Structures are given as structure tokens and as C-alpha cells.
Scaffold this active site. Structure first.
Site, PDB file in Angstrom:
ATOM      1  N   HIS A 139       8.333  -3.376   5.076  1.00  0.00           N
ATOM      2  CA  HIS A 139       8.949  -1.664   4.889  1.00  0.00           C
ATOM      3  C   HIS A 139       9.815  -1.099   5.314  1.00  0.00           C
ATOM      4  CE1 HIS A 139       6.676   2.006   3.501  1.00  0.00           C
ATOM      5  NE2 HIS A 139       7.234   2.478   5.017  1.00  0.00           N
ATOM      6  N   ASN A 175       8.802   8.090   7.440  1.00  0.00           N
ATOM      7  CA  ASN A 175       8.300   7.004   6.722  1.00  0.00           C
ATOM      8  C   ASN A 175       8.341   7.811   4.779  1.00  0.00           C
ATOM      9  OD1 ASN A 175       6.778   4.554   5.443  1.00  0.00           O
ATOM     10  ND2 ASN A 175       5.522   4.429   6.990  1.00  0.00           N
TER      11      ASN A 175
END
Length: 212
Positions: free
Chosen positions: A163, A179
Site C-alpha cells: 500500500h 492515505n
């Protein structure tokens, strides 16, 4: 300095949500570019992750199924520009490439790769240049469901990363990472990760930023 946050220089946009599309590579890559561009030009422009999703398949990305920051930067360089969000908006999935030159928000000439595993080089990049695209191990349920505080995981790997996000600063010892799971995750869509813990979660394994 002991702590930066690049919102202090107007170099960071609002939080985004990638939906059910597995395109953190794109959100992470555009985030660094938005910063660099906003710093240089003095104007923050939202850039298009959809552009990268639709059009970088031939540079070796997988649309909504995954990809890299590097390969997203190559697309921008080879395509001599990325469109901004306003005119190339996120649809949540891979669509036709509608890249239009008239809406080119930004361009670039290369990327600098930070020495794998070095957090002092990473801090130097973040302090002196701008927001840096990174990738981590976000396998843990603790990450998947992080809500607040400093993430400091015992089970985190420093090599197989799954990620990608944008480091937008650091403080006290943490990294401030943005994020793209929208504002209801983490601290307003942010996570504070462990800094100087021998590269916990592989935060400094594959960090880069674009040049322009």
C-alpha cells in the site's frame, strides 16, 4: 527542523478515497507531484489519479488492480503532463483514456529514488524538497482499522509492501502519512507511523518523489 507539515506551505490537498479501486500507487504518486508543483508554482492544483489509472497500462501499471509510483512518473514524463482532477475526475474504476493536453495541470522531468531503508535520507527529502511518495506493509488489521495514535506494529514487514501513500511531514517520533481511504479512516484520513524504528513497515524501502 523538529517537525514539518507541508500544509504549512499550502502544498497538500484534501483527503481522497480510492473507493473499491486498488490504485494507491496513483493517489500516492499524484500527491507527491501536487506538492512539488504547489511549492514551485505557489498554487496548489488538484491532479488526476484517474488519468494515471486509465492511461498508464502500457507503462506497466494494472489500472485498478495495482501498480507503482515509478511507472506512474514515467507515464507523466513520457506523456509530458498529467491532467488535473477538476477536468479528469475519479470514477472509481478504469475507464477510457481521456487525457487532454488543454487540461494539463502539471509536468515533470524525472524522479529521485531515496536510498532504500534510509529514514535520514527520507527525512532530508521531506524537509528540504517536499511530500514524498512511499509504500508500506498495511497487511495488519491494526492498519486496516487504524483510528488514532502512533502506529507501532510488531508484526510489520520491511520488504513486501502492499500500500502506497504520501508522507507530508514528521514529528514527535513519527512520520505523517496521508492515505486515500477518505476522511473517516485514521486521523482525518492521516496516519502517524513509527519513525526511526529501523524502517518499520518498510516506509523507507521504496520512497520517491518527482522532479520538475
Amino acid at each position: 527542523p523538529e517537525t514539518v507539515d507541508w500544509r504549512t506551505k499550502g502544498a497538500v490537498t484534501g483527503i481522497k478515497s480510492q473507493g473499491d479501486c486498488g490504485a494507491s500507487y496513483a493517489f500516492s504518486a499524484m500527491g507527491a507531484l501536487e506538492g512539488i508543483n504547489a511549492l514551485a508554482t505557489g498554487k496548489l492544483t488538484y491532479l488526476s489519479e484517474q488519468n494515471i489509472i486509465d492511461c498508464s497500462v502500457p507503462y506497466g501499471n494494472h489500472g485498478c488492480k495495482g501498480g507503482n509510483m515509478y511507472v506512474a512518473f514515467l507515464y507523466v514524463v513520457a506523456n509530458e503532463g498529467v491532467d488535473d482532477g477538476g477536468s479528469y475526475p475519479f470514477r472509481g474504476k478504469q475507464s477510457s483514456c481521456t487525457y487532454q493536453e488543454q487540461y494539463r495541470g502539471a509536468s515533470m522531468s524525472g524522479s529521485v529514488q531515496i536510498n532504500s531503508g534510509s529514514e535520514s535520507d527520507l527525512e532530508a527529502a521531506v524537509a528540504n524538497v517536499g511530500p514524498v511518495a512511499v509504500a508500506i506493509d498495511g497487511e495488519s488489521n491494526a492498519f486496516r482499522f487504524y483510528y488514532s495514535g502512533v502506529y507501532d506494529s510488531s508484526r510489520c514487514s520491511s520488504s513486501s509492501l502492499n500500500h502506497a501513500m504520501v508522507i507530508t511531514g514528521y514529528g514527535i517520533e513519527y512520520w505523517l502519512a496521508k492515505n486515500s481511504w477518505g476522511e473517516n479512516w485514521g486521523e482525518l484520513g492521516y496516519v502517524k507511523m513509527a519513525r526511526n524504528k529501523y524502517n518499520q513497515c518498510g516506509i523507507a524501502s521504496d520512497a520517491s518523489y518527482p522532479t520538475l
